C-alpha cells in the first residue's frame, strides 16, 4: 500500500504544505476527459481547493501522448501533480522519464523529500508494482486493495529488488512467477474516484450536500458496466443521505430547498424528461429483456402497455403532463404487471434531487446528460488532433453542466442524450438485422464499414455506448455464451478504424457465485503485444486501454494476428 483509506488526510495536508501559497499556482490537476467519475472527482477537488484558496490548474488530457507532452512542457516550479482517472497501470516514472535523483532535495536522518509529488488517483486495479511499491515520487491513493490482496506480490517484488546457487535461482523464478501471474490480468474497476475523494473529505470534514451529490453522480456513473461496484458502494451513499438531510422533514416546499431523496428510481431511460413509452423503448435493459430491435418487440411493448391499462396516448405523453392519476400509480401498476415480462429488475431505488421549484431529477438521468455533453457537446495526424481538441473542449461543457446556475445547459445535455440513444438504437437494429456480428470461438467481431451517422462512433464514449447496448442485448440471450466483443468504426477522413475491445457481463440482477467474480478485460495486453511486433501504425494512447486506432488496410491483418493471439 502507499496511501490507505485512513491516511488520505496525510496526503491532503502534504499537498497543502507543499503548494498552498497565494504567491503562485504550484498545483496542477491532470484530469482524464471522457470519464464522468474523473469529472466529478475533479469537481470535488476544485471546490475543496476553492474553499482553502489553493491556486490550481485543471488540464483535461485525452491520451497518454498528451500527458507526456504536457509533462515535458510542465515547469519545474509546479511541485504538486494530481493525475485523476489514469496513471495507475503504467510505469509512470519510466513513461515520463523520471529519475528520483533529479527531483530529490534534502536527502538528510532516515527520511527523504522530493521537489515534486505526483498523486495518481484512479480505480483500475492492475496497480503497477513499480508505482505502488518501488517509487517515492509517485504516490497512489489506494482504496485498501494493496494492503490486503498484494502481500504475496509485495514479498515477490521486494525479494527481487533486494537480490538484484541453484536454490537462489529456483526461488527467484518462483517469485518472478508470482509477479508474472499478477500481470497478464485484465483491467477492471473496483471503486469510484468520487467515493474515494468523498472519503478524504469526510476525513477533513468538508462534506456537504453538493459534495454528496457529486459523489452520487460519480458512483452512479459505474452502474452501467460495473454494477457490482455500484451495489457495493450504494449503502454508504444511502447512509450519507440520511446523515446529511436536515431534520425539518415534511416541511413546505420553498424556492431554496435542495432535497436529496432515496425514492423509487426505475431503471428506465430519462423517465422524467421523456415519455413513458420512450423510456421503456430506449432502455437498454428493456430492450435486452424484450428484444425490441426486431419487429415483434414493438408489439410486445404495446401489449405490455395495454396490459397495465395505460393508454398509448397517455403513455406517449411527456412525463410532466401525464395525468396525475396514472403518474401516482406507477409503483402499484409496475408491481402488478412487470414480473409477467421479466422486467422485475426495472423497479429500483435511486437518488432524486429537487432544487426548489425546478422539478425532480435522478442521478441516473444526470449522468446520461453529462455523458451526452461529453460526447456531442460541440492529412491523417492533424484532423485526429482536431478531434482530440473538440473532445477536450466538451469536458468543460460537461463541467459547467454541474453548476446549478446552468440548467439551460443540462437540458441541452438531456436533449443530446435522447438523440444519441436514438442513433444508438438505430445502429443497433441495423447491426442485428444484417447479422454483422461474426461469431467466433475467441471473440465476436463486429466492424462498422458503412451506414448513417457513422461519424458519431469515432468518439470512444459513443462507441462504448453502442457496445454496452450490444453487450446488454447479448447478455440476456441464454444461447449466446459469454465472449469478448470487438467494435470498429471506419473514420473516412483519416482512413483509420477505432477498435474497441469490450468485455462480456452477466445479466443484470443475476447474483451467483460466478457473478461475484468480476470479468476482466484482457484486450489491453493483447493489443500491446500485437503492436510491439509487426509494426502496423497502431495508436495505443487512450487511458481506456482496450481502444486503439488502426489504419484501414492494416485492420484485417491485425485481427488475424489477434485471432492467432491466445492472450485474451
Amino acid at each position: 500500500m502507499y496511501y490507505g483509506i485512513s491516511q488520505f488526510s496525510e496526503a491532503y495536508n502534504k499537498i497543502l504544505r507543499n503548494s498552498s501559497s497565494h504567491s503562485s499556482c504550484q498545483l496542477v490537476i491532470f484530469v482524464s476527459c471522457l470519464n464522468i467519475d474523473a469529472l466529478c472527482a475533479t469537481k470535488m477537488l476544485s471546490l475543496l481547493f476553492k474553499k482553502q484558496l489553493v491556486q490550481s490548474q485543471i488540464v483535461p488530457i485525452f491520451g497518454y501522448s498528451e500527458l507526456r507532452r504536457h509533462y515535458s512542457q510542465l515547469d519545474d516550479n509546479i511541485n504538486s501533480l494530481l493525475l485523476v482517472g489514469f496513471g495507475g497501470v503504467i510505469d509512470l516514472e519510466a513513461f515520463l522519464e523520471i529519475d528520483p535523483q533529479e527531483y530529490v532535495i534534502d536527502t538528510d536522518s532516515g527520511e527523504q523529500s522530493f521537489r515534486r509529488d505526483i498523486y495518481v488517483l484512479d480505480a483500475h486495479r492492475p496497480w503497477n508494482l513499480d508505482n505502488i511499491f518501488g517509487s517515492q515520487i509517485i504516490q497512489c491513493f489506494d482504496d485498501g486493495t494493496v494492503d490486503d490482496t498484494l502481500g504475496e506480490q509485495k514479498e515477490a517484488y521486494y525479494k527481487l529488488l533486494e537480490l538484484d546457487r541453484k536454490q537462489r535461482k529456483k526461488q527467484i523464478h518462483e517469485y518472478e512467477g508470482v509477479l508474472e501471474e499478477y500481470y497478464s490480468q485484465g483491467t477492471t474497476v473496483v471503486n469510484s474516484i468520487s467515493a474515494q475523494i468523498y472519503s478524504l473529505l469526510s476525513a477533513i470534514g468538508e462534506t456537504n450536500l453538493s459534495n454528496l451529490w457529486l459523489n452520487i453522480l460519480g458512483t452512479t456513473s459505474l452502474d452501467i458496466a460495473y454494477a457490482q461496484v455500484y451495489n457495493r458502494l450504494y449503502p454508504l451513499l444511502q447512509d450519507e443521505v440520511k446523515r446529511l438531510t436536515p431534520s425539518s422533514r415534511n416541511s413546505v416546499k420553498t424556492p431554496d430547498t435542495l432535497t436529496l431523496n432515496i425514492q423509487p428510481d426505475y431503471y428506465l431511460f430519462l423517465l422524467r424528461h421523456s415519455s413513458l413509452y420512450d423510456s421503456f423503448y430506449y432502455s437498454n435493459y428493456v430492450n435486452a429483456k424484450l428484444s425490441l430491435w426486431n419487429e415483434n418487440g414493438k408489439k410486445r411493448l404495446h401489449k405490455m402497455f395495454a396490459r397495465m391499462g395505460i393508454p398509448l396516448s397517455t403513455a406517449q405523453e411527456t412525463w410532466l403532463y401525464m395525468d396525475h392519476s396514472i403518474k401516482r400509480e406507477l409503483g402499484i401498476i409496475f408491481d402488478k404487471n412487470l414480473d409477467r415480462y421479466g422486467l422485475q429488475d426495472i423497479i429500483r431505488d435511486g437518488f432524486v434531487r429537487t432544487l426548489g421549484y425546478r422539478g425532480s431529477i435522478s442521478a441516473s438521468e444526470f449522468v446520461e446528460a453529462l455523458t451526452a455533453l461529453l460526447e456531442v457537446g460541440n492529412n491523417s495526424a492533424q484532423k485526429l488532433t482536431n478531434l482530440r481538441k473538440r473532445w477536450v473542449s466538451n469536458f468543460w461543457l460537461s463541467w459547467d453542466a454541474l453548476d446549478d446556475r446552468k440548467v439551460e445547459l443540462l437540458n441541452r445535455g438531456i436533449q443530446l442524450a435522447q438523440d444519441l440513444q436514438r442513433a444508438i438504437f438505430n445502429t443497433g437494429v441495423a447491426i442485428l438485422e444484417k447479422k454483422l456480428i461474426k461469431h467466433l470461438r475467441i471473440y465476436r467481431l463486429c466492424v462498422l464499414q458503412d451506414g448513417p451517422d457513422l461519424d458519431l462512433y469515432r468518439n470512444p464514449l459513443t462507441l462504448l455506448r453502442l457496445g454496452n447496448w450490444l453487450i446488454e442485448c447479448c447478455a440476456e440471450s441464454e444461447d449466446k455464451q459469454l465472449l469478448p466483443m470487438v467494435l470498429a468504426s471506419i473514420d473516412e477522413n483519416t482512413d483509420t478504424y477505432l477498435v474497441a475491445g469490450l468485455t462480456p457481463r452477466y445479466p443484470r440482477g443475476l447474483d451467483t457465485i460466478h457473478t461475484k467474480k468480476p470479468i476482466l478485460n484482457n484486450f489491453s495486453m493483447a493489443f500491446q503485444q500485437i503492436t510491439a511486433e509487426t509494426d502496423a501504425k497502431v495508436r495505443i494512447d487512450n487511458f481506456e486501454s482496450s481502444i486503439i486506432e488502426i489504419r484501414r488496410e492494416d485492420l484485417s491483418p491485425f485481427l488475424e494476428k489477434l485471432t492467432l493471439s491466445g492472450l485474451l
Binding site: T534, D535, E553, S556, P557, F558, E560, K561
Partner: protein, 113 residues
C-alpha cells in the same frame, strides 16, 4: 500462350464484335483465382511482419505519381487491364475482374479498383 491456343483452336475449327478470342480466359481463370487467393493469404500473413518489407515495397520511378496501399491489388489491376485491352472479350474479362475483386472485398466499380 492462352490467347495463342484459343486463336489456333478457332483457326482449326473454321478451316471487333467477335474475333478468334472468345474464351481464352477460361483456360487460366480458375488457376489465376486460386493463385490470387493464395497470394492474398500470404500477404495478409507477411504484410506487417518485418524482414518482408523488402518485398512489399513500391518502387520509386521517375513517372511514379500513385500511392499504393495494396500491392497485390495493383498487380491484379494491371493484369485485369491488360486483359481488358481486347474489345471482343470485354464481358468475360469483366466477370473475371469482378471475381478477383471479390477476394479483396472490393466492389467491381470501386474507384480504387
Amino acid at each position: 500462350d492462352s490467347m495463342l491456343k484459343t486463336k489456333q483452336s478457332y483457326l482449326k475449327l473454321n478451316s471487333s464484335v467477335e474475333n478468334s478470342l472468345n474464351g481464352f480466359s477460361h483456360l487460366f481463370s480458375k488457376p489465376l483465382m486460386k493463385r490470387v487467393k493464395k497470394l492474398f493469404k500470404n500477404q495478409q500473413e507477411f504484410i506487417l511482419d518485418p524482414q518482408y518489407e523488402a518485398d512489399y515495397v513500391i518502387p520509386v520511378l521517375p513517372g511514379s505519381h500513385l500511392n499504393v496501399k495494396n500491392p497485390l491489388l495493383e498487380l491484379v489491376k494491371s493484369l485485369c487491364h491488360v486483359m481488358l485491352l481486347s474489345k471482343s472479350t470485354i464481358l468475360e474479362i469483366r466477370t473475371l475482374r469482378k471475381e478477383l475483386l471479390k477476394i479483396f472485398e472490393l466492389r467491381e466499380f470501386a474507384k480504387v479498383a
